Design a protein around this ligand. Structure first.
Ligand code: 41B
Length: 346
């Protein structure tokens, strides 16, 4: 029943459990599915003591239950108690993946070819996300699940949002956007975490990481993060500085003049086509940044690009939840996971 410490209680359908990983409010195991006669992954999530944790759980369930794409992880089943009072944990059943891009980059240097097809799969998945008017907001190697060189799946839609390009600059300390190393400069400079451009920047960082087996911008904190970006891209132009909305223009104007390090000096063994696409993805100005359809049509991905085999969402996605108390989110999580319960009507 239990996996060395915490109880699982996923049976009688899910047996022969083995521990995978853990976090602040969750634990992941592999389990044998006695129905589909295959091994699956089960995410035990206990978020109900904290509002933000509830937001992330609900966010990922609503989005993954609506999405159906080869490069996006799905939700196969959800195990949860029959009453709200009894519900303390939520078990999310997903397809079992061998590993993730983070683990792979620790043991292997990827060939140009593999990188290429990994990049294509990420962008193929992203095209579906963006066509649904959705932003992942946390794209990074550990959120890129793998089985083979031909089987990649984007996971963890906890930070996902519907794209609202014309919305309030919220506040710097109000929301957690990307993982720092993959965080777009617009998020750090003028709190803009509701445009498609932020995801293309993350992908750019992932591409640079596949090319050298190390993160391109490993900042200690967000100012160090901007210093790292500036160290390669160079000191921003007057036009690029006009996009900075905040005090924010100050510390950048305080820094010495940094020249643009050429991509080929940073990555001498990389294909010039990959470095040309990397350049378009890692543009400091979000308005000048390459869009997902343009990245796919780039010459670097010409051997895989096929718009007739790249599915898009049937309709844009719609849900706000961030201002709701943890008790209402628990109620919404109960409603969303009701499909997987016995006796479910309508
Ligand atoms: O949502 C998911 C789904 C999976 C998942 C799904 C299917 N298969 C495999 N296989 C793994 C085999 C070993 O290598 C990594 C992939 N993983 C893995 C992680 N996550 C997120 C990432 O933020 C996560 C991480 C820790 C905790 Cl605690 C958690 F709740 C959620």
């Amino acid at each position: 029943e239990m996996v060395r410490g915490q109880v699982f209680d996923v049976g009688p359908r899910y047996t022969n459990l083995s521990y995978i990983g853990e976090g602040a409010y969750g634990m992941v195991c592999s389990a044998y599915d006695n129905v589909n006669k295959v091994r699956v992954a089960i995410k035990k999530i206990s978020p109900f003591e904290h509002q933000t944790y509830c937001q992330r759980t609900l966010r990922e369930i609503k989005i993954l239950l609506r999405f159906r794409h080869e490069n996006i992880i799905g939700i196969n089943d959800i195990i949860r108690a029959p009453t709200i009072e009894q519900m303390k944990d939520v078990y999310i059943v997903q397809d079992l993946m061998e590993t993730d891009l983070y683990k792979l980059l620790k043991t292997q240097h990827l060939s140009n070819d593999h990188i290429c097809y990994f990049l294509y799969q990420i962008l193929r998945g992203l095209k579906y996300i963006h066509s649904a008017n959705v932003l992942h907001r946390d794209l990074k190697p550990s959120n890129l699940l793998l089985n083979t060189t031909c089987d990649l799946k984007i996971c963890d839609f906890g930070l996902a949002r519907v794209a609202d390009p014309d919305h309030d600059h919220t506040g710097f300390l109000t929301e957690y956007v990307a993982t720092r190393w993959y965080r777009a400069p617009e998020i750090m400079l003028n709190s803009k975490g509701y445009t498609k451009s932020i995801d293309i920047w993350s992908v750019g960082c992932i591409l640079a990481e596949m090319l050298s087996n190390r993160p391109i911008f490993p900042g200690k904190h967000y100012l160090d993060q901007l210093n790292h970006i500036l160290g390669i891209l160079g000191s921003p132009s007057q036009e690029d500085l006009n996009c900075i909305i905040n005090k924010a223009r100050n510390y950048l104007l305080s820094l010495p003049h940094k020249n643009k390090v050429p991509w080929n000096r940073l990555f001498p063994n990389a294909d010039s086509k990959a470095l040309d696409l990397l350049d378009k993805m890692l543009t400091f100005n979000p308005h000048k940044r390459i869009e997902v359809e343009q990245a796919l049509a780039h010459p670097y991905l010409e051997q895989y690009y096929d718009p007739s085999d790249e599915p898009i969402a049937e309709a844009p996605f719609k849900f706000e939840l961030d201002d709701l108390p943890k008790e209402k989110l628990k109620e919404l999580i109960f409603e969303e996971t009701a499909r997987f319960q016995p006796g479910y009507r309508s």
